[PDB]
Amino acid sequence: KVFGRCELAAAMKRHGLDNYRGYSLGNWVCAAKFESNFNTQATNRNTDGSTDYGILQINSRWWCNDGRTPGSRNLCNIPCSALLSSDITASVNCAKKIVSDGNGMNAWVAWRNRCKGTDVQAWIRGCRL
Numbered sequence: 001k002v003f004g005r006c007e008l009a010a011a012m013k014r015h016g017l018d019n020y021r022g023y024s025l026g027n028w029v030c031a032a033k034f035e036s037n038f039n040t041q042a043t044n045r046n047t048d049g050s051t052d053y054g055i056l057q058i059n060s061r062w063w064c065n066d067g068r069t070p071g072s073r074n075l076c077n078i079p080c081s082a083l084l085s086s087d088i089t090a091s092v093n094c095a096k097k098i099v100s101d102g103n104g105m106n107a108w109v110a111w112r113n114r115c116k117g118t119d120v121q122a123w124i125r126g127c128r129l
């Protein structure tokens with residue numbers, strides 16, 4: 001599923017991401033924009049052989065099981081394919097664990113490079129939230 005911007009903002013809010021760990025909703029929408037272009041089916045291979053999955057590009061090295069990332073963990077206790085669903089529940093629940101890990105949203109390199117320190121409220125501007 002390719003979400004609309006405001007559609008994704010509303011889903012993320014309903015699932016408790018608004019201000020989770022202090023990160024306003026615009027931060028999460030901005031991260032999703034640059035990680036996946038709002039496409040739940042996005043997958044991308046990393047140089048280390050792991051793969052990133054879903055609207056927040058969650059990495060099989062630590063967070064989900066894809067059966068093909070040697071020596072990895074599955075700290076969200078989910079198959080990576082569950083992160084590709086039209087229903088964002090699994091991605092949100094796993095993102096909550098990731099952002100609590102110590103480095104906040106810096107875990108998402110694209111958030112640090114493209115969202116951090118910008119006017120992230122623009123990503124929810126106009127949305128009926």
Ligand SMILES: [Cl-]
Nearest residue numbers: 024025026121
């Ligand atoms: Cl915001």
Ligand SMILES: [Cl-]
Nearest residue numbers: 067068069070
């Ligand atoms: Cl594996």
Ligand SMILES: [Cl-]
Nearest residue numbers: 065078079080
């Ligand atoms: Cl699995």
Ligand SMILES: [Cl-]
Nearest residue numbers: 021103104105
């Ligand atoms: Cl933080």
Ligand code: NA
Nearest residue numbers: 060064072073
């Ligand atoms: Na894994």
Ligand SMILES: [Ru+3]
Nearest residue numbers: 011087088089
């Ligand atoms: Ru839902």
Ligand SMILES: [Ru+3]
Nearest residue numbers: 062101102103
């Ligand atoms: Ru850690």
